[PDB]
């Protein structure tokens, strides 16, 4: 339409998991609770058995910048890799 | 007898357990009790000394 | 080892962490590091003279 | 013989859950030292045809 | 049943795998003779 | 901090599929040595039964 | 060679049974084994003296 082509062979077909890792775990399947009420979700996260963010993946008593965190094991060569979160308090 | 190391069992970490081996659940294994966990926990830390 | 602190970081970087930093130091013909060397780079001026 | 102990360490009796995080490097490392894909390629009952 | 009980999360299911090697060869398949008789 | 530079080689800039066949190791030996079969692990979404 | 031996042992240890030892004592910060130091740690009695 109006502009040239220039021939060209078929390219080889790659999708995202060609090029980026999927980090999530085949061998370790958290479970989860059931629950479908509001009241009831916050009686389930206030439970002293539970955490959501441990404490030391909680940076949160700064002046300013609280980060919470998380780790990436390698579970080949056992090598880590730690990601943060930054939030605001100003 | 010999424990793993295609899986990485030592780096699960969940909040306010205060037992490894009650991170785990072993309800469903056909294979795997109770005694199966502890036992493979006392060699998981003999490892570390 | 070498310096690789995370700023305002959670967590004291473990074995796991430092792990990483001794794999990527020992790539074929020292590909992963900077190199450093003792040679003269000045000229410190003489005590009680110029 | 040498002892173990907590020597100049802050270290002291915690629990399993929260004692495996806290001993990283002797634990992993020195279990991916010591384990492969162990396989018998040996045969302890050969009877001829 | 008299005992307080507190509640808690679901933990990860693990199987034997998880833990313990599997120490058989998955490419040698070693063969065996056939034979019922106990002289033989 | 020191600055990247063509010094005393031949090297200019060309495209990005002869580039990456030129930078040989700097590529595929640092990127081997930068991964794993990384996995999560923790878990942020616990809640009771 | 670490001297790591099976008493009552039928085989001799080959390379595959001192390759586990030598995975083992290149551990990271040299976490796998058990260092060793040449320091004084006594007094031997002097030869002709008290």
């Known amino acids: 339409s109006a502009a040239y082509n220039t021939a060209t062979a078929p390219k080889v077909p790659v999708s995202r998991a060609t090029f980026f890792q999927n980090t999530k775990s085949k061998d370790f399947d958290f479970k989860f609770a059931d629950g479908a009420d509001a009241i009831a979700n916050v009686l389930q996260q206030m439970e002293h058995g539970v955490a959501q963010h441990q404490l030391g993946d909680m940076n949160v008593r700064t002046d300013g910048l609280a980060t919470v965190s998380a780790v990436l094991n390698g579970r080949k060569r056992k090598i880590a890799n730690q990601y943060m979160m930054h939030f605001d308090l100003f | ?32 009790n109770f005694v199966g966990v502890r036992g493979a926990s006392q060699q998981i830390a003999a490892v570390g000394g | 080892h070498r310096p690789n602190a995370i700023p305002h970081g ?6 796991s962490e430092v792990l990483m930093n001794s794999r990527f130091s020992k790539i074929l013909d020292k590909k992963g590091i900077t190199k450093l060397e003792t040679r003269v780079g000045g000229r410190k001026r003489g005590d009680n003279n110029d | ?15 399993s859950a929260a004692g495996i995080r806290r001993t990283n490097g002797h634990i992993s490392l020195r279990l991916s030292a010591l384990t492969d894909d162990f396989e018998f390629t040996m045969h302890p009952l050969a009877r001829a045809e």
Do not use: P, W
């Open chain 4, 1 to 15: 013989l040498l002892e173990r102990g907590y020597g100049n360490t802050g270290f002291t009796d915690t629990y």
């Open chain 3, 10 to 15: 959670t967590r004291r970087l473990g074995n």
């Open chain 2, 1 to 32: 007898g010999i424990l793993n190391g295609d899986k990485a069992y030592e780096q699960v970490e969940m909040g306010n357990i205060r037992a490894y081996d009650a991170m785990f659940d072993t309800s469903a294994a056909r294979d795997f």
